[PDB]
Design a protein around this ligand. Structure first.
Ligand SMILES: NC(=O)C1=CN([C@@H]2O[C@H](COP(=O)(O)OP(=O)(O)OC[C@H]3O[C@@H](n4cnc5c(N)ncnc54)[C@H](O)[C@@H]3O)[C@@H](O)[C@H]2O)C=CC1
Ligand SMILES: NC(=O)C1=CN([C@@H]2O[C@H](COP(=O)(O)OP(=O)(O)OC[C@H]3O[C@@H](n4cnc5c(N)ncnc54)[C@H](O)[C@@H]3O)[C@@H](O)[C@H]2O)C=CC1
Ligand SMILES: CC(C)CC/C(O)=C(/O)C(=O)O
Ligand SMILES: CC(C)CC/C(O)=C(/O)C(=O)O
Ligand SMILES: [Mg+2]
Ligand SMILES: [Mg+2]
Ligand SMILES: [Mg+2]
Ligand SMILES: [Mg+2]
Ligand code: NA
Lengths: 340, 341
């Protein structure tokens, strides 16, 4: 039976007189660092000598190297890329982590790989948000939050749970719900979303766009319908609330609803389900983890090549033409991470 | 090259001293009515004797039967289901449409089928928003808009275009962009999104949930990752702004990016391409239109059954379980259609 913590199940008492070192000031680090400060938690940033160090200083944080941040903290949040956990743990964290100190990862990968490990006298946990940085930050400022999963891997102090959930509460996850889930399950689940679901959603949008273009439809209009209008985006985000079939029922004309229900449950052949299983086997079997380590140890040059190639795909050429000629509703993001 | 109107390309001058009859107070009707009212346009609602009639009165609109609203209007927006257009046009609109009056549809279907036709002495246009009612209304109140396609079908007065684009500005569509597109192409494009893409997107989310649960993953966690968390919804909506591959490049960890690009462009078999082609054929050759008419004739009895059947699929059973347990952040839609500035 699932164990889910909300605001009534956590407090900031565990953080009284304690310092949190946010290690890394990237997509997660910046949001955690911002939300912790605004919740009145004493917070530090530990970062290498790169652009994120300068950004942290620009947004008013105490910033040092990782070793000094860890040395001066009761709670350490390791929010750097997963392939870099091993070296930073062995060289910078493990040697400097105080007795009774808590170390938290935001993803189970490094724990499954044995790159981050329990240490005598210290607490090890996962607090893994189900959302990226900007949304977590905007939700927090509007008195809301996104969900998280947590796992208490090692608890020498016996106070690991209260401290992990106090961190979750300070960053806002308890406003949605923080659910117990093993670090190993979170790893395979998270990598599945990234490797099957997300690529497949975009491939499907792209297939809609490519067929419409081949069949002589206006490319701007084809792009707009398949996601560019924001309509498929809204259906999916409104669907998160009330349900996907329920969005079509509430919001679709009878013409739309009859069309939708003619093909609902019939569009995908069994080969899609079978690829999903192949992707899961690769994640669980160690094949992905090996591929990731290869792709990593060049400062991700093969990823740079892929990101640049993607921007010249027809869909993305058409996106730039539509966005130049159609204004999309956005919200000002300036000072979003400065003190509330 | 495309014809795309924004705010600097339209004005409210063509609506000075003119009345708009909104026919229907549904998803589109309620949104048009509110945005028109708030933009300082005199508006009336024409509606049959159902709950939408009472809703329009409760939200403070002048409501009558369709015939009276049309008879007292310079511009008429036909915002009822597409299969009801034929009988309402013949009985309520055509005999009461003033000389020099404009009739607009928000979808090209009734025009393709010939159920709404040009009338001597009058203007006929399509103004088809690329968005449903709630977002249209929320965007408007934020000083933003949804995109729309327009087509001038008949222009007796010579003022059809100015008036269509005037309505578009009043409702907020020109804050995004209003593009000239033929009613026939809008019909097939709009139906294709509804009949191929939207089902495929939900079928794919469903496949994700099903494979995870059948391999013994926590059902609540599986539901959350495939859409329930809002993350995949946020990726698609943010992607509308900056691009889908760009969202993953800006917001995804290096782990996420390496995984995404390992399978991006390799997930779908050719069968999904061929299905989209099959759906376009059914739409273009009149097979869907025949199907919709058989469906409409039953008072949408089959639609009621499928809607109730869908609530019992494991995905939607897991949805209610997740939503009872996790709080999802949403704005109060309660005041959304109340009078504004
Ligand atoms: N991307 C997301 O929104 C989410 C991230 N996570 C997890 O959170 C953690 C942080 O991920 P992101 O914020 O996306 O990462 P990111 O790509 O934004 O990481 C940037 C930060 O990592 C530091 N960094 C990078 N390589 C380093 C190295 N070799 N040594 C030291 N510091 C280094 C940079 O200085 C910078 O502060 C990861 O474990 C990730 O799996 C999980 C949930 C959501
Ligand atoms: N659903 C959407 O978000 C969008 C709809 N459209 C188009 O807008 C038009 C309106 O569709 P929705 O607002 O979604 O429909 P809806 O299902 O919300 O329509 C409800 C309204 O239609 C009236 N109505 C229903 N049957 C009627 C009949 N037989 N005679 C007279 N009035 C009747 C009701 O009294 C009520 O006012 C359609 O042509 C549709 O294709 C296009 C763009 C977006
Ligand atoms: C409910 C969403 C997915 C579709 C709404 C839409 O854009 C239409 O043309 C219609 O419902 O007829
Ligand atoms: C950017 C979206 C699709 C994913 C963000 C997320 O949930 C992760 O675990 C990650 O980036 O590593
Ligand atoms: Mg994730
Ligand atoms: Mg439609
Ligand atoms: Mg549509
Ligand atoms: Mg991840
Ligand atoms: Na429903």
């Amino acid at each position: 039976n699932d164990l889910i913590y909300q605001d009534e199940h956590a407090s900031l008492q565990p953080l009284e007189g304690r310092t949190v070192a946010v290690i890394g000031y990237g997509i997660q680090g910046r949001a955690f660092a911002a939300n912790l400060r605004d919740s009145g938690v004493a917070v530090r940033v530990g970062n290498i000598d790169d652009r994120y160090f300068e950004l942290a200083r620009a947004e008013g944080h105490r910033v040092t190297n990782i070793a000094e941040a860890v040395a001066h903290a009761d709670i350490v949040l390791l929010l750097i890329p997963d392939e870099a956990h091993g070296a930073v743990f062995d060289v910078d964290i493990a040697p400097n982590l105080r007795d009774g100190a808590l170390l938290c990862v935001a993803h189970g990968h490094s724990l499954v790989q044995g790159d981050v490990r329990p240490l005598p006298g210290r607490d090890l946990a996962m607090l893994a948000p189900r959302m990226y940085g900007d949304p977590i930050r905007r939700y927090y400022l509007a008195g809301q939050g996104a969900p998280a999963y947590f796992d208490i891997v090692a608890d020498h102090t016996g106070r690991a749970r209260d401290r992990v959930l106090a961190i979750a509460r300070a960053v806002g996850f308890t406003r949605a719900g923080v659910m117990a889930l093993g670090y190993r399950q979170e790893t395979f689940l998270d990598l599945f979303q990234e490797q099957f679901l997300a690529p497949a959603l975009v491939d499907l949008v792209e297939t809609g766009f490519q067929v419409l273009v081949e069949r002589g439809f206006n490319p701007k209009a084809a792009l707009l319908e398949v996601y560019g209008s924001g309509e498929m985006g809204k259906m999916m985000l409104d669907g998160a609330d009330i349900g996907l079939d329920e969005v079509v029922a509430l919001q679709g004309s009878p013409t739309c609803q009859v069309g939708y229900h003619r093909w609902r449950g019939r569009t995908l052949p069994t080969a899609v389900r079978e690829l999903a299983a192949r992707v899961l086997d690769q994640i669980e079997g160690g094949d992905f983890s090996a591929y990731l380590k290869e792709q990593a140890s060049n400062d991700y040059a093969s990823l740079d090549d892929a990101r640049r190639a993607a921007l010249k795909r027809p869909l993305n050429v058409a996106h730039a033409q539509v966005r130049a000629a159609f204004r999309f509703p956005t919200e000002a993001a300036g000072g979003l991470y400065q003190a509330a």
